[PDB]
């Protein structure tokens, strides 16, 4: 009945804060270095980790994440490396969902990928190029293997499509928006549903995270974590510490 991420957003709202949701791509700068970074997010205060599956044609990603995923693919990263990362995070006590474009999932086998994500301790899937309209197989696999399904909404979303995307989502809805567009989009979700809402808005600072925690249930950070890891692992730790404190404001 309850979603897998339901308890995490309960714990956050009980402690007067939003959830810090941190994205990193598998295999950047290489596979072991990327797992050390994902484990260091759990140690540094991330509540949920988005494990990125590098894709050769990531249309919704900007050049910070795209160049990292290109480097990861040049280094020979494989989809299976993403499931090993999900296991390393779970064993370290963290809470992991996967963000992936749909073709790698189709190529794996949808049912097979969901089974194997579940067996790794993975709690859900974020699906930026899968809409509920094409999600028949995914809905079946999601129920079967008890994974959350985080669909995206946008500022342009029609009233009818927003309600349906929200109704098809479990765990949280990703309000993607990359001044007042983000909080209005969050308001439009709240008017039809009490499902948690995460907001990505190119956050790079403590102050930016605090502003988003005032209305959104989750603060999603991606690009800035990748930029930090490029400088070094201690820069990632320090930046994650600043964001973990931002969400408590």
């Amino acid at each position: 009945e309850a979603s897998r991420l339901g308890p995490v957003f309960d714990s956050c709202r009980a402690n007067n804060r939003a959830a810090l949701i941190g994205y990193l791509p598998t295999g950047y700068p290489d596979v072991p270095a990327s797992v050390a970074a994902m484990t260091a997010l759990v140690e540094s205060g991330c509540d949920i980790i988005e494990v990125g599956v590098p894709y050769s044609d990531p249309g919704m990603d900007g050049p910070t994440i795209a160049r990292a995923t290109e480097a990861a693919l040049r280094g020979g990263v494989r989809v299976r490396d993403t499931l090993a990362a999900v296991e390393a995070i779970s064993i370290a006590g963290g809470r992991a969902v996967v963000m992936t474009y749909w073709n790698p999932v189709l190529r794996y086998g949808v049912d097979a990928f969901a089974r194997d994500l579940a067996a790794a301790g993975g709690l859900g899937l974020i699906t930026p190029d899968l809409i509920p309209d094409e999600a028949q197989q995914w809905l079946a696999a999601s129920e079967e293997h008890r994974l959350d399904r985080i669909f995206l909404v946008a500022p342009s979303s029609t009233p009818e499509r927003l309600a349906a995307t929200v109704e098809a989502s479990r765990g949280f809805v990703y309000a993607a928006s990359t001044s007042q567009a983000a909080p209005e989009l969050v308001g439009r979700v709240k008017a039809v549903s009490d499902i948690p809402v995460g907001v990505g808005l190119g956050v790079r600072s403590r102050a930016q995270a605090a502003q988003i925690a005032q209305y959104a249930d989750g603060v999603i950070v991606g690009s800035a974590l990748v930029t930090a890891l490029t400088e070094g692992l201690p820069r990632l730790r320090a930046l994650t510490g600043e964001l973990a404190a931002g969400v408590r404001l």
Partner: protein, 398 residues
């Protein structure tokens, strides 16, 4: 009858086509679809398009019996559907006129489009100049640096051109960047996509704008030969020219349909663009269709001496027709294509596009197979003025 369902799926549960796009693009995709559904049955729109097809683009294109090829085709009778004579020099004008008229009917003031070596960019900039639309072409940085004159054509036509330096800097990445533009600028922008692929409505809409090739060809061949052909063939990149010529013949059970796709150095070599012969099913650029991809589903580098057939995907309507057994898809190498290019030059005085030469090479082999007196219609999708330098190098004339 041959149309997809309302979600854009061909063949029901196989689920070819569809919409594999983010939610961010769906407002404008529903808008284009509603607009297209409205204008396809509007007499004013079809009249406008027919008037432009006739007086501006030069339709109908002729069907030409290439009698001097016959001896090189087992004495079969090769008829060339001459899309090479259209304004701009290829079938692409059919597509961009339809989409640009739609853009203006929708109230959009800006049109974007992708291009490889320049053909679809030039075609799109042509239709935007005609209709007063603002035009921005996206082109991979590897292509802009070696296609300066096509960039200049586009600029002379009033279009802006953006060199795309992201990803692998070629066609697929130009399409990815045009996609990102359209996500941000959908209020005022229309994406004029250049083949029968992409999410619903693009495969259906592009095909409908290209159907005229087949409708004319079917009439002209009954007129000239006295009967339906034994085969109709075409080269296949994304699939627009092939589907255009094939469509009117789909319910003629004695007409063989053969799509010829680029095999580069050979299918066995890993340097090809043979999407059906060597690819596999997946979601790419908004559609579930065939795709050149590795084991994890990552897109791989395509290779052909032809730039127009260099696209690693293929349209979902073709995937459905392959599954149903209606159309056969066969590989043609660089060597076979260039031999046919030269032969069409020496025998008929027609310089084909290298894309189109794949179809001619395929027709020569089919002629030998079918034998004397067989009637083969070939879509001569473009002229080869753009390929004179490539062909001259191949044959050692420079």
């Amino acid at each position: 009858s041959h149309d997809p369902d309302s979600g854009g799926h061909f063949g029901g549960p196989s689920g070819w086509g569809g919409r594999y796009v983010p939610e961010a693009l769906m407002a404008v995709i529903e808008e284009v679809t509603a607009a297209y559904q409205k204008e396809r049955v509007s007499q004013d729109f079809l009249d406008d398009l027919d008037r432009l097809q006739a007086n501006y683009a030069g339709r109908p294109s002729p069907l030409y019996e290439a009698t001097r090829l016959s001896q090189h085709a087992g004495s079969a009778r090769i008829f060339l559907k001459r899309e090479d004579l259209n304004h701009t020099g290829s079938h692409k004008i059919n597509n961009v006129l339809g989409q640009a008229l739609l853009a203006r009917r929708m109230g959009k003031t800006r049109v974007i489009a992708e291009t490889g070596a320049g053909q679809h960019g030039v075609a799109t900039a042509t239709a935007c100049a005609l209709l007063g639309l603002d035009c921005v072409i996206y082109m991979g940085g590897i292509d802009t640096a070696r296609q300066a004159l096509n960039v200049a054509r586009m600029r002379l036509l009033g279009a802006e051109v953006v060199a795309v330096q992201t990803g692998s800097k070629t066609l697929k990445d130009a399409i990815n960047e045009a996609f990102r533009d359209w996500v941000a600028n959908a209020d005022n922008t229309y994406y004029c996509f250049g083949t029968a692929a992409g999410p619903h409505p693009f495969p259906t809409m592009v095909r409908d704008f290209q159907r005229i090739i087949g409708m004319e060809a079917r009439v002209q061949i009954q007129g000239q030969a006295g009967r339906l052909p034994d085969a109709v063939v075409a080269c296949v990149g994304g699939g627009s020219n092939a589907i255009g010529i094939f469509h009117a013949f789909l319910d003629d059970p004695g007409v063989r349909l053969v799509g010829f796709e680029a095999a580069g150095d050979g299918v066995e070599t890993g340097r090809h663009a043979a999407t059906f012969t060597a690819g596999s099913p997946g979601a790419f650029h908004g559609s579930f269709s065939y795709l050149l991809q590795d084991e994890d589903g990552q897109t791989i580098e395509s290779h052909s001496i032809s730039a127009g057939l260099d696209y690693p995907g293929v349209g979902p309507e073709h995937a459905w027709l392959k599954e149903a057994g209606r159309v056969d898809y066969r590989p043609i190498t660089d060597s076979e294509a260039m031999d046919a290019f030269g032969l069409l030059c020496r025998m008929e005085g027609i310089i084909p596009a290298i894309e189109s030469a794949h179809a001619v090479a395929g027709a020569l082999k089919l002629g030998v197979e079918l034998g004397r007196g067989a009637v083969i219609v070939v879509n001569l999708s473009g002229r080869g003025d753009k390929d004179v330098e490539t062909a001259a190098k191949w044959f050692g004339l420079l």
